[PDB]
Design goal:
Blueprint lengths: L5 H37 L1
Subcellular location: Vacuole membrane
Subunit structure: V-ATPase is a heteromultimeric enzyme composed of a peripheral catalytic V1 complex (components A to H) attached to an integral membrane V0 proton pore complex (components: a, c, c', c'', d, e, f and VOA1).
Family: Belongs to the V-ATPase G subunit family.
């Protein structure tokens, strides 16, 4: 593992956090919203 530097780090970390965070938020948001809308409409 030699690939590493100010840029590669700032970039990798930037997208890492942004992606991970956004993904998670959309995961719980869509998950709960789905279960609610589903149980609501279906029942």
């Amino acid at each position: 593992m030699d690939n590493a530097g100010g840029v590669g780090e700032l970039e990798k970390k930037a997208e890492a956090g942004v992606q991970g965070e956004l993904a998670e938020i959309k995961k719980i948001a869509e998950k709960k919203k789905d279960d609610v809308v589903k149980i609501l409409i279906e029942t």
